[PDB]
A and B are shown apart, each in its own frame.
Chain A
Amino acid sequence: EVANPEHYIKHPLQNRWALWFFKNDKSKTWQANRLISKFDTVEDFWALYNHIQLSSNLMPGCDYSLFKDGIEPMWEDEKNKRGGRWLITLNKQQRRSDLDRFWLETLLCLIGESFDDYSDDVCGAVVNVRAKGDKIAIWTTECENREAVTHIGRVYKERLGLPPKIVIGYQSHADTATKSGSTTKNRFVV
């Protein structure tokens, strides 16, 4: 009496993930503006994905964040404070043409562990829906892990399939401007 798993068992993910939503209130503290749900199988990922609004359908000023269970989508978290992110800056036209598919590919890269061993350095990704231009970013745990960071950025850019000549940069969180712009630099580029 041994049922065949492939017939009734859900496809497990390497990690359990949590989806977060951010609603700008302008007044409230950034943190006060929430967890949606968590999942750790392929089937559960789609069930959640299929019933939530596409990023392009969200009001400007909102964010979707998918992070490994236990890691809050903020700079202050133990797994992000020494880290950084690969930033994808989209123009206004790309909201229609690339925002949604780019975000889905990002999700597939995360849950599918597409960066091989370097996937352990991945914390999560966030998509910012903004009137001036949408942004997508994959956050990693340590900005000093060049090998991991550069390989992730390379595979990520490849997966998105955007023109190879376009360069993207990685910025550490501890380096974000604290003045009025103070030139927010990149530590790496690919």
Chain B
Amino acid sequence: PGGTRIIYDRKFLLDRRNS
């Protein structure tokens, strides 16, 4: 508990597949 974890939703990741 406690900690600024870097979290990415699938949409965010997929939108940069080719970027």
Give the number of chain B interface residues (Cβ < 8 Å): 15
From A42, A114, A119, contact of B16 by CB (8 A): A42
A residues 90-134 near B (Cβ < 8 Å) are 105, 108, 111-114, 116-117, 119
How many chain A residues have a CB neighbour from B under 8 Å?
19
The secondary-structure label for the interface of chain B is loop
| Known pairs A108-B10, A112-B10; A14 contacts B16 (CB<8 A) | no
Residues of B within 8 A of A111 (CB): 8, 13
Q: How many A-B residue pairs have CB under 8 A?
A: 45
**Structural contact, B7 and A43, CB atoms closer than 8 A:** no
Chain B 1-19 near chain A by CB (<8 Å), digits 1 or 0: 1010111111011101111
Contact: A117 with B13, CB < 8 Å? Answer: no
A112 touches B8 (CB 8 A): yes
State the A residues within 8 Å of B (CB).
Answer: 11-14, 42-43, 45-46, 50, 105, 108, 111-114, 116-117, 119, 159
